[PDB]
Each structure stands twice: as structure tokens, then as C-alpha cells.
Scaffold this motif. Structure first.
Motif, PDB file in Angstrom:
ATOM      1  N   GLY A   1       0.711  -1.268   0.056  1.00 41.01           N
ATOM      2  CA  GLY A   1       0.030  -0.041   0.071  1.00 41.01           C
ATOM      3  C   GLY A   1       0.758   1.499  -0.136  1.00 41.01           C
ATOM      4  N   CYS A   2       2.157   1.269  -0.495  1.00 44.37           N
ATOM      5  CA  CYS A   2       2.872   2.195  -0.636  1.00 44.37           C
ATOM      6  C   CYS A   2       2.618   3.230  -1.569  1.00 44.37           C
TER       7      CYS A   2
ATOM      8  N   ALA B   1      -2.563  -5.900  -7.363  1.00 39.54           N
ATOM      9  CA  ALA B   1      -3.280  -5.028  -6.541  1.00 39.54           C
ATOM     10  C   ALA B   1      -4.708  -5.646  -5.973  1.00 39.54           C
ATOM     11  N   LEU B   2      -5.460  -6.242  -6.558  1.00 41.85           N
ATOM     12  CA  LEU B   2      -6.892  -6.786  -6.022  1.00 41.85           C
ATOM     13  C   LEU B   2      -6.705  -8.155  -5.163  1.00 41.85           C
TER      14      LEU B   2
ATOM     15  N   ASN C   1      -5.776   1.496   1.353  1.00 41.37           N
ATOM     16  CA  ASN C   1      -5.202   2.328   0.394  1.00 41.37           C
ATOM     17  C   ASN C   1      -5.354   1.845  -1.100  1.00 41.37           C
ATOM     18  N   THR C   2      -6.231   1.014  -1.432  1.00 44.39           N
ATOM     19  CA  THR C   2      -6.004   0.252  -2.640  1.00 44.39           C
ATOM     20  C   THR C   2      -7.106   0.873  -3.459  1.00 44.39           C
ATOM     21  N   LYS C   3      -8.065   1.910  -2.930  1.00 46.31           N
ATOM     22  CA  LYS C   3      -8.789   2.597  -4.050  1.00 46.31           C
ATOM     23  C   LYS C   3      -7.916   3.433  -4.784  1.00 46.31           C
TER      24      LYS C   3
ATOM     25  N   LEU D   1      -3.008   3.393 -11.436  1.00 41.91           N
ATOM     26  CA  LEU D   1      -2.725   2.469 -12.330  1.00 41.91           C
ATOM     27  C   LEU D   1      -3.694   2.671 -13.603  1.00 41.91           C
ATOM     28  N   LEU D   2      -4.764   2.847 -13.622  1.00 39.07           N
ATOM     29  CA  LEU D   2      -5.691   3.077 -14.761  1.00 39.07           C
ATOM     30  C   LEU D   2      -5.367   4.442 -15.173  1.00 39.07           C
TER      31      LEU D   2
END
Lengths: 114, 64
Positions: A13-14, A58-59, A65-67, A73-74
Motif C-alpha cells: 500500500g505504498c 493490487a486486487l 489504500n487500494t482505492k 494504475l488506470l
């Protein structure tokens, strides 16, 4: 040393160390011979053994903090114009043939990322 | 309870080089520098749904 630090930064989550590695990734594209910019940048963000990409990584590891990692990335894959091959990548080995990045977000029960 | 006593009587009887061959479980890296020789049990649960954190392997298949 580039491919492994990106996988380690996305999983824990960096957020800030991700933006420094992605900006270094564009710097290697300019000062180079520069033959095939889609086929090279897709090769750096993909493990060659199994076909797992960065968005799949990622998923699988859900952070608080993954949202924002999916949003960065997109956003990154659009100006380089490999948005189509990055969102629709698949596994290639025998035991997981055909699993996509959409197929992981539904199982991990993520409504807003879907 | 009566059959469990018969099994542990036959296990004290056979020699040492049989006892290492008939050993259960396998070594599993659980945490940082820790190996504990665990046993594996599978199960299916339908009534309680959650998002999965705190696993060991990302790839859910049987390895090899």
C-alpha cells in the motif's frame, strides 16, 4: 530491480513510492533505442512465468489504500495507450487459464471498484 | 474410544525406521523463520461472507 519493487509497493500500500517508480519507468522509455513502446511497457509490468500483471496483484491484497492504487494504475496506462491490453490481460498457465482482473474484484467483494 | 486405544498400541510396537515412513503432515513456512509440521483439512462454508485477508498463498490451487 524495477519489476520487483513495483510488486512490493502495490501489495503493502505504498502510495508515494509507487509514483516515484512509475515516473522512473517513463524515463527509461525516452533515453533508449525506442523500438516498440507498447510491447516493452507491457512486458515490464507482467511476470513472464504466470502472466500475472500489476493490476491483478493490487486486487489480491486488499489494503486500506487500494482505492487509490487502482486510480493511479488506470490513469498511467492511458497516456501510454496500452489501456486495452492492460485491463484485459489473462493468466497463461494451465491451472488458472482465463482469469481476468474483473474476475478478482468480484470475488473479493469490491462494489465501487467494479 | 475403544478403537483409538488399539491404534496407539500398534504404534508403540513397530520399530523406528517404520515410524519415520508413516509420519503425517508436512513442513509449512508459517511466519518468518518458523516451521511447525501442520496437518491439512478442507471445508466449505456458505452462511458467512467476508473479504479474505490474512492468507499464506495467493495462488489457491494445489501446488504441483
Amino acid at each position: 530491480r524495477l519489476k520487483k519493487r513495483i510488486f512490493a509497493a502495490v501489495s503493502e500500500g505504498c502510495v508515494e513510492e509507487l509514483r516515484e517508480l512509475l515516473q522512473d519507468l517513463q524515463d527509461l522509455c525516452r533515453r533508449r533505442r525506442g523500438l516498440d513502446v507498447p510491447d516493452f511497457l507491457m512486458h515490464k509490468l507482467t511476470a513472464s512465468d504466470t502472466g500475472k500483471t500489476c493490476l491483478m496483484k493490487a486486487l489480491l491484497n486488499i489494503n486500506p489504500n487500494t482505492k487509490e492504487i487502482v486510480r493511479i494504475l488506470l490513469a498511467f496506462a492511458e497516456e501510454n495507450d496500452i489501456l486495452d491490453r492492460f485491463i484485459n490481460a489473462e493468466y497463461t498457465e494451465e491451472a488458472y487459464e482465463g482469469q481476468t482482473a474483473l474476475n478478482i474484484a468480484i470475488e473479493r467483494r469490491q462494489g465501487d471498484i467494479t | 474410544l475403544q478403537r483409538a486405544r488399539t491404534i496407539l498400541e500398534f504404534e508403540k510396537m513397530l520399530p523406528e525406521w517404520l515410524r519415520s515412513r508413516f509420519r503425517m503432515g508436512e513442513l509449512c513456512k508459517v511466519a518468518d523463520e518458523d516451521f511447525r509440521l501442520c496437518l491439512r483439512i478442507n471445508e466449505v462454508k456458505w452462511t458467512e461472507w467476508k473479504t479474505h485477508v490474512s492468507f499464506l498463498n495467493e495462488d489457491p490451487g494445489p501446488i504441483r
